[PDB]
Design an enzyme around this catalytic site. Sequence first.
Site, short mmCIF file in Angstrom:
data_model
loop_
_atom_site.label_atom_id
_atom_site.label_comp_id
_atom_site.label_asym_id
_atom_site.label_seq_id
_atom_site.Cartn_x
_atom_site.Cartn_y
_atom_site.Cartn_z
N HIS A 58 0.85 -1.24 0.00
CA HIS A 58 0.00 0.00 0.00
C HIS A 58 0.86 1.27 0.00
O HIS A 58 0.32 2.34 -0.12
CB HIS A 58 -1.04 -0.02 1.24
CG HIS A 58 -0.65 0.46 2.64
ND1 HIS A 58 -0.31 -0.29 3.66
CD2 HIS A 58 -0.57 1.78 3.09
CE1 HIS A 58 -0.04 0.48 4.67
NE2 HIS A 58 -0.20 1.73 4.34
N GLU A 79 19.00 7.15 8.83
CA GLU A 79 18.22 8.32 9.28
C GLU A 79 17.79 8.22 10.69
O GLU A 79 17.60 7.14 11.19
CB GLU A 79 16.85 8.49 8.49
CG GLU A 79 16.99 8.89 6.99
CD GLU A 79 17.21 10.44 6.84
OE1 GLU A 79 17.40 11.06 7.86
OE2 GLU A 79 17.18 10.92 5.73
N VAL A 104 16.75 16.77 8.92
CA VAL A 104 18.15 17.30 9.06
C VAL A 104 19.23 16.38 8.58
O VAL A 104 19.19 15.24 9.01
CB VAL A 104 18.43 17.63 10.60
CG1 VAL A 104 19.87 18.19 10.77
CG2 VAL A 104 17.44 18.69 11.14
N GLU A 131 23.62 9.43 6.65
CA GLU A 131 22.63 8.95 5.66
C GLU A 131 23.15 8.50 4.33
O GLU A 131 24.23 8.90 3.97
CB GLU A 131 21.62 10.06 5.38
CG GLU A 131 20.97 10.62 6.68
CD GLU A 131 21.68 11.85 7.29
OE1 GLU A 131 22.82 12.10 6.98
OE2 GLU A 131 21.04 12.52 8.07
N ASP A 139 -0.13 -7.57 1.95
CA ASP A 139 0.40 -6.18 1.91
C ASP A 139 1.91 -6.12 2.12
O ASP A 139 2.34 -5.68 3.17
CB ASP A 139 -0.28 -5.35 2.99
CG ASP A 139 0.02 -3.85 2.85
OD1 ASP A 139 0.50 -3.46 1.80
OD2 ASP A 139 -0.26 -3.19 3.84
N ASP A 153 0.54 2.30 20.02
CA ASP A 153 0.23 1.64 18.70
C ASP A 153 1.03 2.29 17.58
O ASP A 153 1.66 3.33 17.80
CB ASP A 153 -1.27 1.86 18.41
CG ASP A 153 -1.90 1.01 17.29
OD1 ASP A 153 -3.07 1.27 17.04
OD2 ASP A 153 -1.23 0.15 16.74
N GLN A 197 -0.66 6.02 11.00
CA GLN A 197 -0.26 6.39 9.61
C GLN A 197 1.11 7.09 9.64
O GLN A 197 1.47 7.85 10.54
CB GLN A 197 -1.31 7.34 8.91
CG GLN A 197 -2.18 8.11 9.90
CD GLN A 197 -3.05 9.08 9.10
OE1 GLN A 197 -2.63 10.19 8.87
NE2 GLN A 197 -4.22 8.72 8.67
N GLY A 198 1.87 6.81 8.62
CA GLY A 198 3.23 7.39 8.47
C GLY A 198 4.21 6.30 8.88
O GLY A 198 5.36 6.41 8.50
N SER A 240 3.37 3.05 8.27
CA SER A 240 3.14 1.98 7.24
C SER A 240 4.42 1.51 6.56
O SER A 240 5.24 2.35 6.23
CB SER A 240 2.24 2.50 6.15
OG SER A 240 0.95 2.58 6.74
N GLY A 241 4.53 0.21 6.38
CA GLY A 241 5.74 -0.36 5.71
C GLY A 241 6.88 -0.64 6.64
O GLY A 241 7.75 -1.41 6.28
N1 LIG Z 1 -3.87 1.45 14.31
C1 LIG Z 1 -2.78 1.32 13.61
N2 LIG Z 1 -1.74 0.68 14.03
C2 LIG Z 1 -2.66 1.89 12.36
C3 LIG Z 1 -3.44 2.88 11.82
C4 LIG Z 1 -3.06 3.23 10.52
C5 LIG Z 1 -3.69 4.20 9.74
I1 LIG Z 1 -5.29 5.26 10.38
C6 LIG Z 1 -3.22 4.46 8.44
C7 LIG Z 1 -2.15 3.76 7.94
C8 LIG Z 1 -1.53 2.80 8.72
C9 LIG Z 1 -1.99 2.54 10.00
S1 LIG Z 1 -1.36 1.36 11.18
CA LIG Z 2 18.54 13.18 8.53
#
Ligand SMILES: NC(=[NH2+])c1cc2c(I)cccc2s1
Ligand SMILES: [Ca+2]
Length: 223
Positions: free
Chosen positions: A40, A52, A57, A62, A84, A171, A174-175, A177-178
Amino acid sequence: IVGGYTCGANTVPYQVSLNSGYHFCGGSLINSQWVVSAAHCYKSGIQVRLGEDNINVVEGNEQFISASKSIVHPSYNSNTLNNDIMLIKLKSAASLNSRVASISLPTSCASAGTQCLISGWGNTKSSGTSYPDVLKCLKAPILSDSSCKSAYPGQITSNMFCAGYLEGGKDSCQGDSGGPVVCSGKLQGIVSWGSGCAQKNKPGVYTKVCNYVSWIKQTIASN
Ligand SMILES: NC(=[NH2+])c1cc2c(I)cccc2s1
Ligand SMILES: [Ca+2]
């Protein structure tokens, strides 16, 4: 990452930031020329940034390398997020050192209860938006499939597992992901999805990497 802590510069040496003019997903270095991330997070025009810590910065450790190709898993379903996972080959082989290291793939799947380390530059608020510039870490255990399936009925497949706290508070988000979920020295998961972040009875859902090791090994040896 919500309710996590600052990792410390280069303490997660296999963590990667995918950048297309800005940071959009995390990834894991599995060997000098390959990275695994989430399907995704697929984008054309990715630059992989290794070593990183503060992503805004240039601190000196890096390596910024462009991707030569991306392979999304043949059975990835963007509607359910089943399978995924994606592999990214680098244009040049990274220089591994103390700040840039690869992570090992698992030999078997991990047990519910195993504590893992999750890291990323994602959002740190459940209700709100606050993006950090330094890497954040979170230790969370793998949850039983039963609690994963009851939280998300009819949405969990055998290629996904939940990790976290049913009470909420800690938890991935978003950000993130991956990004990696490392348990006992092996890459066992990929940040995939969840219902909001750190909500009660809504743990994060991760790609179960142990089910793709033959596909990864076969794909990287033929590309
Ligand atoms: N609850 C979670 N761990 C996540 C929530 C998100 C969301 I909202 C967007 C993208 C990835 C994830 S992982
Ligand atoms: Ca940096």
